[PDB]
Amino acid sequence: VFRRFVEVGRVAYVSFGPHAGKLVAIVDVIDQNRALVDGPCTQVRRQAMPFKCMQLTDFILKFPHSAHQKYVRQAWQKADINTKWAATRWAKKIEARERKAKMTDFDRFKVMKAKKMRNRIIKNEVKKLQKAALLKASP
Amino acid sequence: SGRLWSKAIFAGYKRGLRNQREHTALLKIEGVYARDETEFYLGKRCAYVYKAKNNTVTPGGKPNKTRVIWGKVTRAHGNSGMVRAKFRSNLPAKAIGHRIRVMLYPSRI
Amino acid sequence: EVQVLVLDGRGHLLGRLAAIVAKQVLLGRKVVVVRCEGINISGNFYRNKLKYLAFLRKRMNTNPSRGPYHFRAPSRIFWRTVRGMLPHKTKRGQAALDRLKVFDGIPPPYDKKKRMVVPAALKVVRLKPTRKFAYLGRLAHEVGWKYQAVTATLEEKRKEKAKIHYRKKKQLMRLRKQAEKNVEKKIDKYTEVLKTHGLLV
Amino acid sequence: FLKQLASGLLLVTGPLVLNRVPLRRTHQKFVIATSTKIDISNVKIPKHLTDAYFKKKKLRKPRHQEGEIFDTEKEKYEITEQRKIDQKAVDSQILPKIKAIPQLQGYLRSVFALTNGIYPHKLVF
Amino acid sequence: KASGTLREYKVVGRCLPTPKCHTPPLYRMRIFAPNHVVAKSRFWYFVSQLKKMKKSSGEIVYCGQVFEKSPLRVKNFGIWLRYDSRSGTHNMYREYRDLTTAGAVTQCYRDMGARHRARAHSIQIMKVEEIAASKCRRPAVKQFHDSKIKFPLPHRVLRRQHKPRFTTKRPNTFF
RNA sequence: CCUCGGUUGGCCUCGGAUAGCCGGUCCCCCGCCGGGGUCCGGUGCGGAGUGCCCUUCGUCCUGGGAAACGGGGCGCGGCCGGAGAGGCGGCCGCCCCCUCGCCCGUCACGCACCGCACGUUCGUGGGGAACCUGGCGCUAAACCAUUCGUAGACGACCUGCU
RNA sequence: GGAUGAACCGAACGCCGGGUUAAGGCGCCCGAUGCCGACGCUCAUCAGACCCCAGAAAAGGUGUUGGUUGAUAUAGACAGCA
RNA sequence: ACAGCCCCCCCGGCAGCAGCACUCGCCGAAUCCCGGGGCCGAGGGAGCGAGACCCGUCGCCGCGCUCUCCCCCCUCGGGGG
Ligand SMILES: [Mg+2]
Ligand SMILES: [Mg+2]
Ligand SMILES: [Mg+2]
Ligand SMILES: [Mg+2]
Ligand SMILES: [Mg+2]
Ligand SMILES: [Mg+2]
Ligand SMILES: [Mg+2]
Ligand SMILES: [Mg+2]
């Protein structure tokens, strides 16, 4: 049933807290509630971190547990987690949320105009397809 | 042309459990549900707009039934985005659960 | 808000939803709770039935016709629960109580409308998965409610009609996706604006 | 926005051909500054455009103390030929910079409004 | 004694010199306290219990916080303590996993309060020691000694239950 | 006229599970549409309520795109669906309009009321008396009095009266 | 403030505006946690829920959670079957 | 070893330093600048001087310029060093 697991080398996304919006690697597990956590390439120094503010991703790095920053950083850079992360639908959904949030009034006006025209064209095509499908006569 | 004011609800007066300070009112602004989001609305003018029986003079217009009690947001209240408002006269108690307009007037943005 | 807030009672905990609804109607908001037979109560069914039977026992000894009115429908049970969180002996509380409507099943005004959900009152997130719970409809039926069967039949008809409507909506959305694929050279100019400003990933 | 005057009132003109706002004073407390800007450097705002230029003019009430005959004349404010010339002179060099950036003129033609879902504290201007 | 996130303090004290011993011995203790004022108070409590010293007849020559020498390493802590129950006094040995010794002692105080209703004034921490993973005795601590540890997060409860307060979609607990 | 004021865009709907879901598609079975078995996608829900839709300055020259199998009818007539409180919704036929409304441009104009509030909607709002204007329609009961006695303190009740 | 209350807890009082607290609180009544609060314990077919205070004991439980001491076990424990 | 971990080293080197990669403190003679919201405006003859005369732009405190002269940079005498 489960596909994403808490384990050494698993890359997690920080949902909230001081490090929200960042990627980290799980270096070790502490007492079912916390994990020794290290983002050497995403600017999260080694520290404890609760599992509540983690959202596991699909990337697993291969380093032994409680390895140093050097080995975590080499595991991160080789098979680059930054670009592979940015390529995912998750990361660009986050990016779309951010750029929708930072949109100004003129940008909202332009989006309103473009969306108006786009919706009208799509609706005309939908009506055309409906009438094309309404010409069915078969016993 | 457009609404141009934020909707708020007159939730009640500033009060203890068994004491009520009617000189200041509590407003629930729609869409503001955290204390840190209330900083925009501090100092903004707010109006309680209502209708009555007799006509009253309208600034820049003909007399009508509309009357206003003016006020402004003074500070935040609670952690959940309440605000406190001081009006020129204390709000009537029939206005509890009714519309208050936050007018964006003293803009700082 | 200014519209009527329609809340689906299925999967919701009684007191949690009632506290939310009471605060909403005290803030001057129209609230309509549908499908009150689907409301859950934490704790096992025998315990909750015992609580309601104690409530049944509480009656006025001199003249029970004046005493507490024990309402057996799930909608009326939820209504009385909300009244217990409202200040119903003042004019403000009575107006707040008037701003609330409760129904068993989903009546024709509201079966054709979208229904909201309160996560802070949902059983799935507010209750541990190993704990037991009771259904308000079953409790009401076994404590005196008479219309469990007819409400179930009407709910099943409503669900069949909703399935038909949902199939129509799915077919329309498939046709819309096909339309977007059909017109893309005349759409990409505005699609790029939307993508640039974060709408439409 | 063009310039702050000597009294701190802003002098603005959403060009009259766009949204019917002439060269007009306004208070910075009662405006919202958006992020969109047009480079109106090295345009020439005429020097006579001052607070005394934009101050309101009044007629009443000389040689008349008790009102028995209606004095509602002159209530029609008249636009001066000088004001029309100034508006033309400013707009003639404001408008080409507006048209230089796409669909800014439609933005200036439209008015601002609060849709039911949008909130000014989350809006970026 | 209340709590917070406790800190370790090295507290060194001694009796005041008298014309019986010009150089009284120096005594050192580890005190886990919210702050240095409480640390000094607990030092005087403990040395009054052990030696025949008082705050008035003695002085505190040093009170400094002890920083953890490896806060980036998960390690096992055994704690020997004693406490007063409602009906007697008992000695306990408890085990925890934490990065810091002070964090482990804070975990101990919370756990004693949770399981035995023991308030912090009843608890006397008498030894704290980092132990090897083979020396551990508590299975709840031992089960995390896996080089290939792996578990999911089965039933993730929605914590943002009020943003939004009202919504159309029901939450998902599977991730 | 009199009176009561609120409000200041809409969402027209699967069922649900939560140690799982959602979407799409080829073969089997039931009336050309659904149910299964594959297979392919998505899943910190993007076929997303942290969403979607509509979007209000108005016109006049004036070009390029969208459309042109198109929009409007408080225009008529017909049909269908909806009963849980249907108080609603959808589809056709005739007729009458404009080729305008949607996007990007060209062109100038409107009280530009000289900084200022209750502005902007629902709305042709609800309710009550009354006047005028036309069309199409209706001509009743209840109570008292009387009688009854299946009833009864009195009321009430059961009854009868070209 | 303790729902309520001569005595409890805070604090003592001219008529007011603003700020901040005490004791006590912050699901709703009812102002305030609508914190993505922390760690555990607990299921009650009479659960529990805050000084005074408004109800309980001895004695039990193979319910569950910790802890103390002791013992057996690959020279094969323990439990089952013979 | 075809990964790593802990301690002592014969000794370290560079950067940064209670970190602007939000791991963990106490502070400011070792501390300053800027901004926003709210409430308020009580008082009313402050002139040692001219012998006041238009309503004392006054006391304390902190400053600038001139009663010296050279230069420098922008305006067209004014402004800034
Ligand atoms: Mg009291
Ligand atoms: Mg009490
Ligand atoms: Mg005391
Ligand atoms: Mg006060
Ligand atoms: Mg209380
Ligand atoms: Mg409250
Ligand atoms: Mg520093
Ligand atoms: Mg004064």
Per DSSP, the three-state class of E119 is: coil
Environment class of C22 (CB within 10 Å of its CB; exposed 0-12, middle 13-18, buried 19+): buried
* CA D5 to chain centroid: 13
The closest of C71, C80, C84, C78 to C33, measured between CA atoms, is C78
Q: Which amino acid is at B63?
A: P
Token couple for B41: 């609305």
Q: Is the CB of E116 under 7 A from strand G?
A: yes
Q: Quick one: CA torsion of E103, E109, E115, E121, rounded to 10 degrees?
A: 180
Q: What is the side-by-side order of every strand in the sheet holding D3-4?
A: D3-4, D10-12, D24-26
Token couple for C119: 């996560």
The C1' atom of F79 and the CA atom of C173 lie apart, in whole Å, by 28
Q: For D110, which of A101, A102, A109 is closest by C-beta distance?
A: A109
Token couple for C170: 């799915």
Per DSSP, the three-state class of C89 is: coil
Q: For B109, which of D30, D32, D119 is closest by C-beta distance?
A: D32
Q: What is the side-by-side order of every strand in the sheet holding E58-65?
A: E26-33, E7-15, E58-65
Please state, in angstroms and rounded to a whole number, the distance separating the CA atoms of residues C181 and C179: 5
Nucleotide nearest to C170 (CA to C1'): F47
Please state, in angstroms and rounded to a whole number, the distance separating the CA atoms of residues C60 and C50: 19
Category of A59 on φ-ψ map: left (φ > 0), alpha (ψ -120 to 50) or beta:
beta
Please state, in angstroms and rounded to a whole number, the distance separating the CA atoms of residues D64 and A101: 62
Please state, in angstroms and rounded to a whole number, the distance separating the CA atoms of residues C5 and C102: 12
CB C97 within 8 A of CB C21: no
Q: What spacing in Å lies between the alpha carbon of C177 and ligand 1's midpoint? A: 67
The dihedral built from the CA positions of residue C174, C175, C177 and C178, taken in this order, carries a sign that is positive
Partner residues linked to E125 by β-bridges: E81
Q: What spacing in Å lies between the alpha carbon of E2 and ligand 3's midpoint? A: 20
Nucleotide nearest to C109 (CA to C1'): F85
Please state, in angstroms and rounded to a whole number, the distance separating the CA atoms of residues C14 and D97: 63
Q: Which amino acid is at A18?
A: P
The closest of A63, A49, A62 to A18, measured between CA atoms, is A49
Partner residues linked to A39 by β-bridges: A44
CB C119 within 8 A of CB E171: yes
Per DSSP, the three-state class of E110 is: helix
Category of C108 on φ-ψ map: left (φ > 0), alpha (ψ -120 to 50) or beta:
alpha
Please state, in angstroms and rounded to a whole number, the distance separating the CA atoms of residues A99 and C199: 9
The C1' atom of H77 and the CA atom of D58 lie apart, in whole Å, by 39
Chain A residues with CB under 8 Å of D36 CB are 104-106
DSSP codes, C6-75: EEE-TTBBHHHHHHHHHHHHHTT-EEEEE-GGG-EEES-HHHHHHHHHHHHH---SS-GGGS-----SHH
Q: For A31, which of E72, E97, E151 is closest by C-beta distance?
A: E97
Please state, in angstroms and rounded to a whole number, the distance separating the CA atoms of residues C190 and C186: 9
Please state, in angstroms and rounded to a whole number, the distance separating the CA atoms of residues D118 and D110: 17
Q: What is the resolution of this structure in A?
A: 2.7
Count of Cβ atoms closer than 10 Å to residue A119 Cβ: 12
CB A8 within 8 A of CB E149: yes
Per DSSP, the three-state class of E93 is: strand
CB C9 within 8 A of CB C78: yes
DSSP codes, A68-94: -HHHHHHHHHTTTHHHHHHTSHHHHHH
* CA A90 to chain centroid: 3
Please state, in angstroms and rounded to a whole number, the distance separating the CA atoms of residues B91 and E73: 61
Please state, in angstroms and rounded to a whole number, the distance separating the CA atoms of residues A71 and A77: 10
Environment class of C150 (CB within 10 Å of its CB; exposed 0-12, middle 13-18, buried 19+): exposed
Please state, in angstroms and rounded to a whole number, the distance separating the CA atoms of residues A91 and A96: 9
Cα E94 to Cα A82, E68, E111, E129: the distances in Å are 42, 20, 10, 11
Cα E52 to Cα C29, D32, E22, E39, E47: the distances in Å are 71, 75, 17, 19, 7
Alpha carbon of E85: minimum distance to chain A alpha carbons (Å): 27
According to DSSP, the β-strands at C100-102 and C30-34 are parallel
Q: Which amino acid is at C1?
A: E
Please state, in angstroms and rounded to a whole number, the distance separating the CA atoms of residues E128 and E107: 12
**Tally of residues, chain B:** 109
CB C72 within 8 A of CB C143: yes
DSSP codes, B14-25: EE-SS-EEEEEE
According to DSSP, the β-strands at C30-34 and C4-8 are parallel
Buried b (16+ CB within 10 A) or exposed e, C88-101: eeeebbeebbebbb
CB B46 within 8 A of CB B72: yes
CB C136 within 8 A of CB C72: no
Interface with chain C: mutation pick from E155, E159, E161, highest number of C CBs within 10 Å: E161
Give the list of residues 6+ apart from residue A6 with CB closer than 8 angstroms, or none.
A26, A29, A35, A51, A56, E149, E150, E151, E152, E153
Per DSSP, the three-state class of B86 is: strand
What is the CA angle E25-E26-E27, rounded to 5?
120
DSSP state of E153: -
Q: Which residue carries 């009244």 as its tokens? A: C83
Q: What spacing in Å lies between the alpha carbon of E34 and ligand 3's midpoint? A: 26
Please state, in angstroms and rounded to a whole number, the distance separating the CA atoms of residues E63 and E9: 6
Interface with chain C: mutation pick from B96, B98, B100, B101, highest number of C CBs within 10 Å: B96
CB E31 within 8 A of CB E9: yes
Count of Cβ atoms closer than 10 Å to residue B25 Cβ: 27
Nucleotide nearest to A48 (CA to C1'): H23
The C1' atom of H67 and the CA atom of A122 lie apart, in whole Å, by 86
Q: Which amino acid is at C42?
A: S
Partner residues linked to E15 by β-bridges: E58
Q: Quick one: CA torsion of A45, A50, A51, A57, rounded to 10 degrees?
A: -20
Please state, in angstroms and rounded to a whole number, the distance separating the CA atoms of residues C165 and C154: 17
CB B83 within 8 A of CB B27: yes
Q: Which amino acid is at A90?
A: W
The closest of D10, D9, D13 to D89, measured between CA atoms, is D13
Q: What spacing in Å lies between the alpha carbon of E1 and ligand 3's midpoint? A: 19
Q: Which residue carries 């009796």 as its tokens? A: E15
Give the list of residues 6+ apart from residue C57 with CB closer than 8 angstroms, or none.
none
Give the helix/strand (H/E) hosting D108: helix D104-109
Count of Cβ atoms closer than 10 Å to residue D107 Cβ: 20
Please state, in angstroms and rounded to a whole number, the distance separating the CA atoms of residues D32 and B104: 9
Q: Which residue carries 């299925």 as its tokens? A: C10
Buried b (16+ CB within 10 A) or exposed e, E88-111: eeeeeebbbbbbbbbbbbbbbbee
DSSP codes, chain A: -----EETTEEEEE-SSTTTT-EEEEEEEETTTEEEEEETTTTEEEEEEEGGGEEEEEEE----TT--HHHHHHHHHTTTHHHHHHTSHHHHHHHHHHHHHT--HHHHHHHHHHHHHHHHHHHHHHHHHHHHHT-----
Give the list of residues 6+ apart from residue C101 with CB closer than 8 angstroms, or none.
C31, C32, C33
Count of Cβ atoms closer than 10 Å to residue A29 Cβ: 22
Count of Cβ atoms closer than 10 Å to residue E168 Cβ: 10
The C1' atom of F135 and the CA atom of B64 lie apart, in whole Å, by 39
* CA B55 to chain centroid: 23
Please state, in angstroms and rounded to a whole number, the distance separating the CA atoms of residues C6 and C113: 8
Q: Which amino acid is at D14?
A: G
